[PDB]
Amino acid sequence: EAEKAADESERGMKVIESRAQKDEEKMEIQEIQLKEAKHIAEDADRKYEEVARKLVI
Amino acid sequence: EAEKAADESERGMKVIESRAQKDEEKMEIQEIQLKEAKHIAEDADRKYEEVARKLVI
Amino acid sequence: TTALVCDNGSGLVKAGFAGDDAPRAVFPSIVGRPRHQGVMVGMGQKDSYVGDEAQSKRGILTLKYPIEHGIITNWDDMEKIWHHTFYNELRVAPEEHPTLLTEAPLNPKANREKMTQIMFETFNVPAMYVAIQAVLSLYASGRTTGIVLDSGDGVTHNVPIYEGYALPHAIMRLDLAGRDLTDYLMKILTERGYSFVTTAEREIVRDIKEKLCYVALDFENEMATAASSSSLEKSYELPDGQVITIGNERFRCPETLFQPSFIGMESAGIHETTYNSIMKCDIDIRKDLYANNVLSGGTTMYPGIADRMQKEITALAPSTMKIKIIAPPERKYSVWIGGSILASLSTFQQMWISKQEYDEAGPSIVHRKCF
Amino acid sequence: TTALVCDNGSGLVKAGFAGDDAPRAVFPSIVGRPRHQGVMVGMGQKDSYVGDEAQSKRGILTLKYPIEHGIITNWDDMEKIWHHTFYNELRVAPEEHPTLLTEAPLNPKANREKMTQIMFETFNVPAMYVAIQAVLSLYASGRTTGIVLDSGDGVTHNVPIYEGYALPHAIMRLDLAGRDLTDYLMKILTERGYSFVTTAEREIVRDIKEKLCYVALDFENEMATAASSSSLEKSYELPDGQVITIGNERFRCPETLFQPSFIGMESAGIHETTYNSIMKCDIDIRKDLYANNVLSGGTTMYPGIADRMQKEITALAPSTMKIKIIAPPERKYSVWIGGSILASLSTFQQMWISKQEYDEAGPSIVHRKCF
Amino acid sequence: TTALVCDNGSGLVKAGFAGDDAPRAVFPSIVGRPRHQGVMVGMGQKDSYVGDEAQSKRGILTLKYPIEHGIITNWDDMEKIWHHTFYNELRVAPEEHPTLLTEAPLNPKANREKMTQIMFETFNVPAMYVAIQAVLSLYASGRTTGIVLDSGDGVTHNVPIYEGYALPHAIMRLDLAGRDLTDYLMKILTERGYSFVTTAEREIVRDIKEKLCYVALDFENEMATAASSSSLEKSYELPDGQVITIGNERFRCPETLFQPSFIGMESAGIHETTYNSIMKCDIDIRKDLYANNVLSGGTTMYPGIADRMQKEITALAPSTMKIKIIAPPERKYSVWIGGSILASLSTFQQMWISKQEYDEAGPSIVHRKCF
């Protein structure tokens, strides 16, 4: 009985680190796209600040 | 020996499932902040274009 | 010159030649004396059993630890331990073997002075050296930065190192260690009907702690689980029978490292002392210290301690920084491996305290430019 | 042959070869010494880190600037900086390459003499020359008249030039520069609860000053806006998390250039010194000088400094007068470009200070006709 | 009506009425909570002991200082301390008594704003005012010109005043103070074998520091004498026994004020910060500041500090300048004396921040011309 339980537990293990590495890759890609989104947002913000100063002057 | 292996596998299961849930709200937070960053970037771009037209005139 | 390397530690003595990746002799630092009278005539028992033989005769002797928390408290036992290590275990002549000794941070200077005096005047070693446990542990891990936590049986300390430069003002020392955990294990097993009072039962309780204890990722949830289900109960074989079943006491004992209020201590857990020691350092090196947390010592071998400490530090550290904890399988013997690596280096050959230099400079030579 | 155009500056050393379009090597001019002791043996750290290497070890080093306000105070550090520049950043042997050095106006003759002596003796350059940092900036702008304002990190000087003839009596030098702005930013960041005291944190505060600070068109109106609104607050991420938000302290730091009384200075603002130097000149060359205000130096890189300066000088100048301020994108590297252009000229080949001429005329030859 | 002068300080609250020669309420600013269970029933035990009462029960309480370095880091504890001071130590109703408070320079605005809000809302004082702790020390000394050093328990700073005019650009603030000295004494007492870790032992270490520590005129010479002779040894009697003997640690602890590198701090000693602040000022007022060096604060009562600092400054100052240090015996209470004197003036009566003014202008009125 213990051997059967251990085999089931180890199969569950292998599959759960399979989803673990898939989720690791997913976090990597979403974190990268977060970086590009933040950079483009701050660039747009500074660009509008500059053109607002130009408009008022 | 089999019982010890099963206990270790179950401990790893619990730890990685907790990490998986943490990852789930990480996805949620990343998605909402990505949406907000995209929205503010689009708004900044459109008001940038309006300010540019005002600058030209 | 096949220099000798020793690690007195606390509760275990491990020694061997330099250039090896494993100690050749590991045995408890225990000296015991008979307490009964003895009626058999002609066998001629010796007046003191030292080392591993005291464990074989554990049921007739009174075991005593010559060191309480790093500091030696019974010196004659220490000459006995060193003589045993040098002769009965390694079978070496210390007249031609330099000896490297490992010592804990933040200790009385008289301790190091007496160690050097004993080494030079009793065993007549040609040269010797005293080093810090954490630096050797970081040698053995193949790193150059990162805060290292060394929890043995006597004392737990954290030493932050960056690019080979120590940060002494951020070194923290806590006296909570394995012996306190064993005492709390007895104090918490006495509520089930099991009473261990004698120094021989110290060893049995220590074995139970080593074999059946683990650190839980959560405490309240684990307590709720154990209070309802019976899946956490395990049985142990005492050296004569009468199996004992331990329930929630298996994960309650190691919780003292994270909740030191259990034994009346005022300080905070290791997960908080490490974070405080990291925060005492400069702001430009906190990233490498966060990402290179190194574990060592026998006490850090509880199943699940690394995950719990990582979770706690991540809860403490800023959410925008990764936290990594390095827990190699050989945490217990890491310090000796680092010591052997250091002694095998050729640039270390000019850092020995020679016999002539010691004779010229007196016992106070330890704290001079030669460390 | 090829000539080298160097620019020691203050806090940023930029160098290269004559005829190039941009400097080849740009790195901070700092020297760092390990303030700790070092526990790991065998690594053998160097006793002095120079250049951008010292920026990577800000957490174990103390940073010292060999130049405080234009002048060189520590000469061994400057020699180390020059050796590093010639042998690592450029990897060129200077025994066969003339060098073109630069210095600020109104400096002690001892500094120039010792610079020439060091260049001729330690490195044995075949020839050398020293040029004013403002003439080169005027060269790089493709002009021949008009004042130029080289506001760097150490000194801020305003040199008027008309038709290639300099006016030495109208040169105005002011010591308020980027370093004072960084110190004032340190002082005013404590107002929000952030304390930056260590020399390593000086680099961090400089980074915030470079990234977030801007010059306000109207100080009082922006004060009213920031007090009521909250759209001026931006957050900066420290090297260890714990992001910090700075609001009103954003345009207060560069206001010191126009309001020197903020840091206890008595002198008038940059806009007023420019106007005073304009009226110091003749009356028949004021039109071209008004219409050719040239800006250069790293400090003049704040967003909106040109508009504020133009507004102030137009308020000072007569209403029937036209004012133009020239602010190219490459203000920071304008001096080096002008130096390269000057060294590339064919008529300049007869103005080098030869080694034989130096040996014949002593170190004082530099102040002679050979400038 | 009469005004109240409250000096929160950091770890020692002194308060009293305005127009007296000394405060009538001096007690530590500490709050204690019981960390044990409590088995006796009907005892009516309180959940928080504040003030000198907590000092009487240090063995059952954990002690927390609400102020780390000038800034209050716990506002509930500060409210408890103020309520205790107003209702038990002074036994006066704050509904008809103006209150004068003190704080260090370079203090975050939020601290001052919330202090004024707490004073006006909870206690409902009719008027209040906040003043710097250095101007008050100048008032107590009877002077009107001279740099004043106020080294308390949390923060050490220098404020130069000439003819009643302050120079804000020459103010230097340092966080090294008595608490850091106590921590360093704790660190170095483990060298001899004495360990003090609990907050209860903090008061014991503080008493040892107050009773035995002194500043040496020369550091190397006293180290040479102590390492050879034995006349510097002095014994202290612990609350129970096992008297301890202190050698060079007796004068090693206060050396941090002149050698901040002992605790890993980058900043320079007070003898050098004072010189830097003197040279930061003008050139025509340096003579008076040299000849009117004023000392205050509790930490400035080490035997021999007023001589070592004078020697250091004379070594730094030009040879043709006379250096004088004023160290009255009542250094600790100088700030309160100055505050009482200031509140006694009839001219000062118009500088009170009335309740109507606060209601009209919000908590931000404090930073206006009504300082």
Ligand SMILES: Nc1ncnc2c1ncn2[C@@H]1O[C@H](COP(=O)(O)OP(=O)(O)O)[C@@H](O)[C@H]1O
């Ligand atoms: N597998 C294990 N699980 C739990 N605790 C352990 C384990 N192995 C050793 N220990 C504890 O570690 C201690 C040994 O510490 P040790 O590494 O010998 O310190 P030192 O090397 O300084 O003497 C023992 O007292 C024991 O309680």
Ligand SMILES: Nc1ncnc2c1ncn2[C@@H]1O[C@H](COP(=O)(O)OP(=O)(O)O)[C@@H](O)[C@H]1O
């Ligand atoms: N974009 C920027 N905004 C504000 N300050 C800047 C910017 N870029 C550079 N600086 C400042 O200019 C200084 C560099 O000046 P630099 O031209 O190198 O002087 P020098 O020519 O004397 O070396 C730096 O200290 C930095 O603080």
Ligand SMILES: Nc1ncnc2c1ncn2[C@@H]1O[C@H](COP(=O)(O)OP(=O)(O)O)[C@@H](O)[C@H]1O
């Ligand atoms: N005779 C003494 N020798 C050394 N230190 C002292 C002496 N008297 C007081 N101190 C230190 O001064 C501190 C009190 O400072 P204090 O004047 O209360 O500052 P503040 O009023 O700003 O809180 C105490 O913590 C104590 O350690």
Ligand SMILES: [Mg+2]
């Ligand atoms: Mg150990």
Ligand SMILES: [Mg+2]
């Ligand atoms: Mg420049």
Ligand SMILES: [Mg+2]
């Ligand atoms: Mg004070």
